[PDB]
Design a binder for this molecule. Structure first.
Ligand SMILES: CN(C)NC(=O)CCC(=O)O
Ligand SMILES: CN(C)NC(=O)CCC(=O)O
Ligand SMILES: [Cl-]
Ligand code: NI
Ligand SMILES: [Zn+2]
Length: 348
């Protein structure tokens, strides 16, 4: 399904929305994973929070100033940690005439201004803030407790990895970016825009992921030479015009307040925020993910880089391959077009 591998949008009914793992299995049966990214608009009647009016006190312990250097569509982003600040302090900086959204008529225009001005007037991103904005009673798509098999890490080793099996919050402002990357251990990820201006996304089909990597390696040989997974440093920006010029397939989509974005295993993506907004996200998994976990190329140059032990997963979900895998002889080749097993029932 989905032979063009374009980003799909879904509209679950409340009945469909209730079972998260089941709906993820559903959209995959429709080919949604092929684009590496998919949007899910929740039923009009759902809401994770009554109001977002008491958080002006929330502290953003580590805001980041995003300095970007580059030319001709190729850039490197340097984060500079600023002193803690609360939301109030952030919104005002964000809406001030110095950092606010430019005037525009269409998205094509804002996109152009982004790529033309990303190296100028470095903005601040209140990123990676531990926490959730969900009310403790919301049981549908609660990013704080999705109950997928990824819980097996916490559940067998008590190991929690901030932002991975725990929720993160991001407060952005015009021009703040997320560099090209796949998730840690090439996991899935879910992102919910709580409020504010839109966030635009770019994505490359998992099946064409290696092509993006060769492109990046070609443009940054030094970086490539010292880390086998330098894109995991989340510092590399490449414009759609460069992607188009070198033949890399990609699609773009704009997520609005109240919408979810799901990224799939080995799906490269990047993007930027339109203005002041707040988003929440975490990582999750399905059975199809295990093979990806086992074959993910990891960052070989830093410390505290996320490394999940695939052992408990192979043991429990692939008992017949455990011995071969342990011996380093498991040579399964991943087929990026195959939906996850849990999708069987929608393919009857
Ligand atoms: C988890 N991942 C899909 N989320 C993103 O890449 C967006 C992060 C951001 O909003 O800066
Ligand atoms: C129930 N939900 C998970 N799935 C759907 O509504 C789609 C069912 C189908 O495959 O037509
Ligand atoms: Cl280089
Ligand atoms: Ni991501
Ligand atoms: Zn590295």
């Amino acid at each position: 399904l989905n032979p063009s591998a374009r980003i799909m949008t879904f509209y679950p009914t409340m009945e469909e929305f209730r079972n998260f793992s089941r709906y993820i299995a559903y959209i995959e049966s429709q080919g949604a994973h092929r684009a590496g990214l998919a949007k899910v608009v929740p039923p009009k009647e759902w809401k994770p929070r009554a109001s977002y009016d008491d958080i002006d006190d929330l502290v953003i312990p580590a805001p980041i100033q995003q300095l970007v250097t580059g030319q001709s569509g190729l850039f490197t982003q340097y984060n500079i940690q600023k002193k803690a600040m609360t939301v109030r302090e952030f919104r005002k900086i964000a809406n001030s005439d110095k950092y606010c959204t430019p005037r525009y008529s269409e998205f094509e225009e804002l996109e152009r201004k982004y790529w033309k001005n990303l190296t100028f007037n470095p903005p601040i991103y209140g990123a990676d803030v531990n926490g959730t904005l969900y009310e403790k009673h919301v049981d549908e798509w609660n990013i704080g407790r999705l109950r997928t098999i990824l819980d097996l890490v916490e559940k067998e080793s008590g190991i929690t990895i901030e932002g991975v099996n725990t929720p993160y919050l991001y407060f952005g402002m015009w021009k703040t970016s997320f560099a090209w990357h796949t998730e840690d251990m090439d996991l899935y990820s879910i992102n919910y825009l709580h409020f504010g201006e839109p966030k635009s996304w770019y994505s490359v089909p998992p099946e064409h992921g290696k092509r993006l990597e060769r492109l990046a390696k070609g443009f940054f040989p030094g970086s490539a030479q010292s880390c086998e997974a330098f894109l995991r440093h989340k510092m590399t920006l490449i414009s759609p015009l460069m992607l188009k010029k070198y033949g890399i397939p990609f699609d773009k989509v704009t997520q609005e307040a109240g919408e979810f974005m799901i990224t799939f295993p080995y799906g490269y993506h990047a993007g930027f925020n339109h203005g002041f907004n707040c988003a929440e996200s975490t990582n999750f998994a399905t059975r199809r993910w295990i093979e990806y976990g086992k074959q993910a190329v990891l960052c070989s140059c830093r410390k505290d880089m996320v490394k999940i032990s695939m052992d408990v997963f192979v043991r429990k979900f692939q008992p017949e391959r455990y011995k071969l895998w342990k011996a380093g002889k498991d040579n399964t080749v991943i087929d990026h077009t195959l939906p996850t097993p849990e999708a069987a029932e929608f393919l009857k």
